[PDB]
């Protein structure tokens, strides 16, 4: 059924799955409390990504274990798009570069986050595109790791071809030429490589992580 | 000159500029210790790096950048670049990595170094994926150039914006080149989009392997790992 979705239906479902923008309640305390609350919505958001519930729980948890920080980051970067120089962690928590210095080592990631946000800005990324990218992150990041082993990986890649299709359909409908569609597709997906980088540097900086058993409980 | 190339001229440019396959140090002690295996791999990686600098200077658009940005892009990209070279070389060797034609290692010989087994398995997996996708050489040289230009672009003023804008134009051209090969090979427009995406999603995996690898090299206290920024600017000169 997830494989039979049209482009419009794919977008419509992902737009409906979007978690809410939460509010903040030492600076690590705030961000952590916040990220924990965003995490719970993310689990329930992931179950509404088409094709995700068609996976075993082992593979749902593995995809979530490899993607959770990329997912928080792309959401953060998206929120902040219309607030240059600042990171809109929450509407009552708009931090700038310099306030990143409050915590040692945080400055570096803060600046990468900002740059991404500026990149999305000057590409003028759309909310329709955003939700497609966020799902690609979910499905794509942990997939490169028996009877179920091959069938699941194939399913995931066929879904990903569908989100590709969606992204293209959206671009065509927006008035982009074929060449322009290809290019914008590549530009968006190359930015994902930067978000992986940021996720690894942030995951390193946090050394405070969802364990395999932890996430398995939340799906159920 | 760079943005005036055609698809065909771009491929040829990148194909001609490919660096050579090199051999490991000959007649090392086998089996290896955790030290000697790293010594062989490190001697080999260092030697590849010199060829990579001269390769980087032939990727269209790269020399058009100031010297500070060229060194920045290489700092960010060098291990990703060494890793995709490896993955490619190891495509027709299931379950094995072809570090050198005289150094073909399986999963078990990665256990010889604490922590390498993990990275090893990520490299094998990526290698299989290229095999199943049937990655061509023409596509490979585009992906390699894409890693070089893109990995560091989002991390560096009127001119600092001119340099980004330029890099993205070249990148936009390598993308056209990728598509043009896919069309020339006779894939449908849909198939073309899906393959382009599958390929660029893999770069995301390569970046993850490169960060982990970078973490691993720092882990076992290798003084010094990584080409320092100091080091690459030396080699970039003439
Ligand atoms: C990019 C970013 C942060 C960010 C992330 C890394 C570095 C950095 O400088 C900022 C921290 C953060 C992220 C994750 C985090 O996870 C903690 C793990 N949880 C505690 C539970 C187990 F005890 C699971 C803590 C802080 O705050 C955020 C948010 O609140 C919401 C969205 C993005 C971020
Ligand atoms: C991927 C890789 C290494 C590798 C693989 C797994 C883990 C790891 O830390 C390094 C290791 C390496 C050792 C020292 C340095 I300085 C750089 C790379 O040896 C290599 C040689 C050539 C090559 O193309 C890739 C590698
Ligand atoms: Cl939205």
Curated annotation (Swiss-Prot), chain A:
Stated role: Nuclear hormone receptor. The steroid hormones and their receptors are involved in the regulation of eukaryotic gene expression and affect cellular proliferation and differentiation in target tissues. Ligand-dependent nuclear transactivation involves either direct homodimer binding to a palindromic estrogen response element (ERE) sequence or association with other DNA-binding transcription factors, such as AP-1/c-Jun, c-Fos, ATF-2, Sp1 and Sp3, to mediate ERE-independent signaling.
Protein's UniProt name: Estrogen receptor
Subunit structure: Binds DNA as a homodimer. Can form a heterodimer with ESR2. Interacts with FOXC2, MAP1S, SLC30A9, UBE1C and NCOA3 coactivator. Interacts with PELP1, the interaction is enhanced by 17-beta-estradiol, the interaction increases ESR1 transcriptional activity. Interacts with EP300; the interaction is estrogen-dependent and enhanced by CITED1. Interacts with CITED1; the interaction is estrogen-dependent. Interacts with NCOA5 and NCOA6 coactivators. Interacts with NCOA7; the interaction is a ligand-inducible. Interacts with PHB2, and UBE1C. Interacts with AKAP13. Interacts with CUEDC2.
NR LBD domain: residues covered: 6-220
Post-translational modification: Phosphorylated by cyclin A/CDK2 and CK1. Phosphorylation probably enhances transcriptional activity. Self-association induces phosphorylation. Phosphorylated by LMTK3 in vitro. Glycosylated; contains N-acetylglucosamine, probably O-linked.
Residue ranges of the region described as Interaction with AKAP13: 1-220
Family stated for the protein in its record: Belongs to the nuclear hormone receptor family. NR3 subfamily.
Lipid group attachment sites (S-palmitoyl cysteine): 132
Note: Selective estrogen receptor modulators (SERMs), such as tamoxifen, raloxifene, toremifene, lasofoxifene, clomifene, femarelle and ormeloxifene, have tissue selective agonistic and antagonistic effects on the estrogen receptor (ER). They interfere with the ER association with coactivators or corepressors, mainly involving the AF-2 domain.
Entry's free-text remark on domains: Composed of three domains: a modulating N-terminal domain, a DNA-binding domain and a C-terminal ligand-binding domain. The modulating domain, also known as A/B or AF-1 domain has a ligand-independent transactivation function. The C-terminus contains a ligand-dependent transactivation domain, also known as E/F or AF-2 domain which overlaps with the ligand binding domain. AF-1 and AF-2 activate transcription independently and synergistically and act in a promoter- and cell-specific manner. AF-1 seems to provide the major transactivation function in differentiated cells.
Residues of the full protein shown: 306 to 545 of 595
UniProt organism field: Homo sapiens
Top-level taxon of origin: Eukaryota
List of residues binding 17beta-estradiol: 38, 79, 205
Phosphotyrosine, modified sites: 212
Gene that specifies this protein: ESR1
Tissues expressing the protein: Widely expressed. Not expressed in the pituitary gland.
Disease involvement: Estrogen resistance: A disorder characterized by partial or complete resistance to estrogens, in the presence of elevated estrogen serum levels. Clinical features include absence of the pubertal growth spurt, delayed bone maturation, unfused epiphyses, reduced bone mineral density, osteoporosis, continued growth into adulthood and very tall adult stature. Glucose intolerance, hyperinsulinemia and lipid abnormalities may also be present.
Region spans: Transactivation AF-2: 6-220
Compartments reported by the entry: Nucleus; Golgi apparatus; Cell membrane
Region (Self-association): 1-220
């Amino acid at each position: 059924l997830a494989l039979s979705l049209t482009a419009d239906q794919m977008v419509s479902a992902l737009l409906d799955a979007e978690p809410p923008i939460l509010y903040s309640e030492s600076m690590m305390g705030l961000l952590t409390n916040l990220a924990d609350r965003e995490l719970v919505h993310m689990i329930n958001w992931a179950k509404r990504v088409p094709g995700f519930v068609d996976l075993t729980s082992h593979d749902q948890v593995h995809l979530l274990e490899c993607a959770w920080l990329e997912i928080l980051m792309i959401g953060l970067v998206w929120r902040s798009m219309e607030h240059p120089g600042k990171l809109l962690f929450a509407p009552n928590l708009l931090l700038d570069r310099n306030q990143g210095k409050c915590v040692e080592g945080m400055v570096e990631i803060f600046d990468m986050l900002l740059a991404t946000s500026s990149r999305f800005r000057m590409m003028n990324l759309q909310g329709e595109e955003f939700v497609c990218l966020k799902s690609i992150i979910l499905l794509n990041s942990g997939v490169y790791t028996t009877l179920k082993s091959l069938e699941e990986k194939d399913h995931i890649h066929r879904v990903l071809d569908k989100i590709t299709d969606t992204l293209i359909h959206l671009m065509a409908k927006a008035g982009l030429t074929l060449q322009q569609q290809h290019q914008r597709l590549a530009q968006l997906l190359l930015i994902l490589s930067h978000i992986r980088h940021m996720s690894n540097k942030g995951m390193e900086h946090l050394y405070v992580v969802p364990s395999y058993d932890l996430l398995l409980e939340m799906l159920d």
